[PDB]
């Protein structure tokens, strides 16, 4: 209709400078398209240099961009298809499925940089979410709409633990699961998909109970700094529309902090202390404070933590631990005694064991 | 012929004045601006060219408009001097805030003067007996020199300075100029009441001190100059009257930190750890005007705050070479209750030579530092295994060392409300004989706790007798 067409003037790695013709400029955090022979290439405007010229971070590979290509605008932020049709469909951060099950016939398309809920709507007494596993609901109970730090490396039944959470939330509270691998290893991405088919939580013919968002490792860092927001918006539509209690799984939040570091070091902002980006607290808060409990429903998050170099004064776990309501450790010395699950009792402590 | 300019740039405490008269006001001159709150004083730091100066702001610059008229005063920031300023609380500019009227004094000298010449330098081996144990044993303070209290966050810099006030400034006879640089406003008020009650400040009468304050509330233009105001009042009495001048300065580190809050804004490249690059010269100009000439003596006591006990910080490490008698205060000593927490190891002085304080004094100090160095060396094996795995000379050495540490404590006349004990002013010779007695082994069977928080060895015997009559 009335397009906002400009020219790419500069490609620097994952940073892309887009010139627009005058009196047309979209604000920060708005989705821009570039049509390629391979598909579409999405940009998110992050800085305005003046001169009717914006500066974006990539969301896919930026090889082969002739400077001077047309830049199409979509006005709003990165749109994602939401709702019932998204279940069992591996959506990347763009909004397109990659399982080759055709396009997703979803009903709405939502922005991802939305407002967090206002203070009058925050639920004023955090009850206990009945998960279903015994040692969870006994010792370190998960806060309904709270945050849960699931530690421990792979191979201790962590995927078994998280599928068990999927089935038990499907039974007891009837809530759906939104899994999100930020920075997920691609091979174990496929192994997780195959195992979630064979365990029954993904039915390719019936009604599956989970939405997968896999932001792969080989995407540029602007992707991984929004994949968690994509999973968050798919959680928010199930919360505030259909009124449920939805489990948002995020692995692995330290790779999200790396995505923040590399986005705000590619933009030329001065790096902070240890080397994480100086927008650390705010760009953790814009992921944390949208996971809460309103009077309609709630989204409870289980998010892993890769503790860097086995150290807990490093600011990325020292910032995540200013938000986590309850920890859950899957240790080695408990599965070594052949115990399923391996919820270690002495370590997994809650702020809601009161 | 007033020289008018325009404010063309404000960044916090740094303001730019464009002139159109080709006579630009020189470096270190004072501009002023009529504000709706009164007036506000600027100090010209560097010419940018283009008929534009770039100045530091002696007070807060909330609410200037680009283009506001800037007025010249010709010279540097003038400060009232003389006997008129005694018992008065002079701010950085020179507006008193004791609200007892303006300071009807004769001269107003500028702050920025050069240090004295090398031929004007004077030396003095005048030993100042202070009455503290840990000073007068291990690091004797020098009259006419300078005295540093390197100290961490809350291990008794300010309490030790009030101790030296209460033990010197009454029996001094010269004058005293206290200078609150970036310390607490409340501590300034408490020192003001202590000066009123103890007759140092005599309000209606004649006083002996001059308060030059300006605290951590002030924006960093004031803290980079308030020590210069106290300095000018000090060296006036050093030069105009020919007296002895006590110059207590607390805290000298806030000066250099005000040196670090403007230099990132004045376009200087950031130096090492975050401070300015103009550090040794600015600390040099502030230290080398506190000296001792052939006209009078300045025996100054300067606190030094150290950020988080890292003595490789560039500002106190620069400060170490300017001081004739350091005194290190460490938090790891102060947690064990040893007050004051004077590090007996790293304390030095230009004094404490055998030909200066006497051979006996020097030998006692050397033996005490040998015993405490032996303790600090054997620290690790004590921490791992315990005291039982030593030899039988060294176990006696460790035990006598831990006697002498708890004996280094001294109940202060100012910290009386923390410990509940009245003050102890122990003279020098009793301390020398006391440490000689404990070194020679005359008291090796006394329990250790009786050495703690005591005056002299007579009170050690008395307190051991008290605990003997109590424990029985």
């Amino acid at each position: 209709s009335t397009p906002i067409t400009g020219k790419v003037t500069a490609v620097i790695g994952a940073i892309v400078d887009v010139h627009f013709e005058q009196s047309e400029l979209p604000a920060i955090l708005n989705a821009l398209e570039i049509k390629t022979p391979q598909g579409k290439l999405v940009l998110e405007v992050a800085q305005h240099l003046g001169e009717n010229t914006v500066r974006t971070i990539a969301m896919d590979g930026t090889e082969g961009l002739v400077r001077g290509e047309k830049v199409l605008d979509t006005g709003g932020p990165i749109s994602v298809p939401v709702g019932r049709e998204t279940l069992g469909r591996i959506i990347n951060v763009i909004g397109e499925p990659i399982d080759e099950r055709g396009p997703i016939k979803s009903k709405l398309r939502k922005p991802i940089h939305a407002d967090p809920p206002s203070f009058a709507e925050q639920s004023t007494s955090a009850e206990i979410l009945e998960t279903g596993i015994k040692v969870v609901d006994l010792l370190a109970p998960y806060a309904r709409g709270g945050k849960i730090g699931l530690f421990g490396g792979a191979g201790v039944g962590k995927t078994v633990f998280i599928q068990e959470l999927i089935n038990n939330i499907a039974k007891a509270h009837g809530g759906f699961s939104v899994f999100t691998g930020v920075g997920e290893r691609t091979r174990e991405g496929n192994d997780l998909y195959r195992e979630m088919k064979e365990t029954g939580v993904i039915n390719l013919e019936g009604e599956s109970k989970v939405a997968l968002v896999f932001g792969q490792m080989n995407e540029p860092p602007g992707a991984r700094a929004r994949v968690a927001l994509t999973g968050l918006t798919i959680a928010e539509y199930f919360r505030d529309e259909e009124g449920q209690d939805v489990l948002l799984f995020i692995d692995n939040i330290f790779r999200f902090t790396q995505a923040g570091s590399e986005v705000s070091a590619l933009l030329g902002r001065i790096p902070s202390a240890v080397g994480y980006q100086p927008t650390l607290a705010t760009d953790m808060g814009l992921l944390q404070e949208r996971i809460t409990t309103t009077k309609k429903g709630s989204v409870t998050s289980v998010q892993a933590v890769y503790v860097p170099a086995d150290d807990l004064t490093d600011p990325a776990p020292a910032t995540t631990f200013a938000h986590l309501d309850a920890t859950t450790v899957l240790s080695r010395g408990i599965s070594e005694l052949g115990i399923y699950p391996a919820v270690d009792p002495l370590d997994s402590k809650s702020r809601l064991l009161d | 012929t007033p020289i008018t300019g325009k404010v063309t740039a404000v960044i916090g405490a740094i303001v730019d004045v464009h002139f159109e008269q080709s006579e630009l006001p020189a470096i270190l001159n004072a501009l002023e601006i009529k504000t709706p709150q009164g007036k506000l004083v600027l100090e010209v730091a560097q010419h940018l060219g283009e008929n534009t100066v770039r100045t530091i702001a002696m007070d807060g610059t909330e609410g200037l408009v680009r283009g506001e008229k800037v007025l010249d005063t010709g010279g540097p920031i003038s400060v009232p001097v003389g006997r008129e300023t005694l018992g008065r609380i002079i701010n950085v500019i020179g507006e008193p805030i004791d609200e007892r009227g303006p300071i009807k004094s004769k001269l107003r000298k500028p702050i920025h003067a050069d240090p004295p010449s090398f031929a004007e330098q004077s030396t003095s081996a005048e030993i100042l007996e202070t009455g503290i144990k840990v000073v007068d044993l291990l690091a004797p303070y020098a009259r006419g020199g300078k005295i540093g209290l390197f100290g961490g966050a809350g291990v008794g810099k300010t309490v030790f300075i009030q101790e030296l006030i209460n033990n010197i400034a009454k029996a001094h006879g010269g004058f005293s100029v206290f200078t609150g640089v970036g310390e607490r406003t409340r501590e300034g008020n408490d020192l003001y009441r202590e000066m009123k009650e103890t007759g140092v400040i005599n309000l209606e009468g004649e006083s002996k001190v001059a308060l030059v304050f300006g605290q951590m509330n002030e924006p960093p233009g004031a803290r980079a100059r308030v020590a210069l105001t106290g300095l000018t009042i000090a060296e006036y009495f050093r030069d105009e009257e020919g007296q002895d001048v006590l110059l207590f300065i607390d805290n000298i580190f806030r000066f250099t930190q005000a040196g670090s809050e403007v230099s990132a804004l004045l376009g200087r490249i950031p130096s090492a750890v975050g401070y300015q690059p103009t550090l040794a010269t600015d600390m040099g100009l502030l230290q080398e005007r506190i000296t001792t000439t052939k006209k009078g003596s300045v025996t100054s006591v300067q606190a030094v705050y150290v950020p988080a006990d890292d003595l490789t910080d560039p500002a106190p490490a620069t400060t170490f070479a300017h001081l004739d008698a350091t005194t290190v205060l460490s938090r790891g000593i102060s947690e064990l209750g040893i007050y004051p927490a004077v590090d007996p190891l790293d304390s030095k002085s230009r004094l404490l030579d055998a030909a200066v304080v006497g051979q006996e004094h020097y030998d006692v100090a050397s033996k005490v530092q040998e015993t405490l160095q032996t303790y600090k060396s054997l620290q690790d094996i004590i921490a791992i295994l315990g005291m039982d795995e030593l030899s039988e000379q060294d176990k006696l050495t460790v035990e006598r060392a831990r006697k002498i540490q708890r004996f280094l404590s001294q109940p202060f006349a100012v910290a009386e409300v923390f410990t509940g004990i009245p003050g102890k002013l122990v003279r020098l010779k009793d301390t020398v004989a006391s440490f000689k007695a404990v070194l020679e082994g005359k008291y090796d069977n006394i329990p250790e706790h009786a050495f703690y928080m005591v005056g002299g060895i007579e009170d050690v015997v008395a307190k051991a007798e008290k605990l003997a009559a109590e424990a029985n």
Binding site: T2, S23 | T8, E20
Partner: protein, 187 residues
């Protein structure tokens, strides 16, 4: 004491030019010659524009300057000399910008206080005229000085109008008023 500061962003070349020519009167001529050289750049667009590139030379920039002044003998006097400095300083690329800025300074000397009457759709002439009069019949302009006025079309606004000039504006339009109505009723 020159009027309307450039201050910073490369208008200082113009500032120097202005003040150097302000003491020697000839500014309109300078201004006219700037108009003429800007037009003869515009009326020869291949390599009148596209030969304002930084990769040429010292010497070729100087000879373009000579080629530029070859078309007209005695190009004012001062603006023929300033180009040489810029040619040597290689700030030629940021040049017509300097033309626009000298124009702003010049018509500030005339006092043309350029305004604007933003809308989302162009308007009749009667409104234009009545507003221009009002703006001329205003405190704003102290008279003795002119008053341009430009209507622009803005879709980002929902209609109404806003008057602008002397970094002083009034907005009685629709979009802002919807905003304020919303804000007060969104509590």
């Amino acid at each position: 004491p020159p009027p309307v500061r450039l201050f910073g962003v490369e208008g200082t070349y113009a500032t120097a030019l202005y003040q150097a020519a302000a003491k020697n009167s000839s500014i309109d001529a300078a201004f006219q010659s700037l108009q003429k050289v800007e037009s003869t750049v515009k009326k020869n667009p291949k390599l009148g524009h596209l030969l304002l590139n930084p990769a040429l030379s010292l010497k070729d920039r100087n000879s373009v300057i000579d080629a530029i002044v070859e078309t007209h003998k005695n190009l004012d006097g001062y603006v023929v000399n300033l180009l040489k400095v810029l040619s040597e300083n290689n700030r030629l690329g940021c040049f017509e910008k300097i033309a626009s800025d000298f124009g702003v300074l010049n018509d500030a000397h005339n006092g043309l206080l350029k305004g604007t009457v933003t809308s989302a759709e162009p308007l009749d002439p009667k409104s234009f005229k009545r507003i221009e009069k009002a703006l001329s019949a205003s405190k704003l302009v102290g008279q003795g000085k002119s008053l341009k006025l430009e209507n622009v079309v803005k879709p980002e606004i929902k209609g109404g109008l806003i008057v602008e000039l002397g970094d002083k504006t009034v907005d009685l339009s629709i979009s802002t008023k919807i905003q304020k109505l919303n804000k007060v009723l969104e509590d």
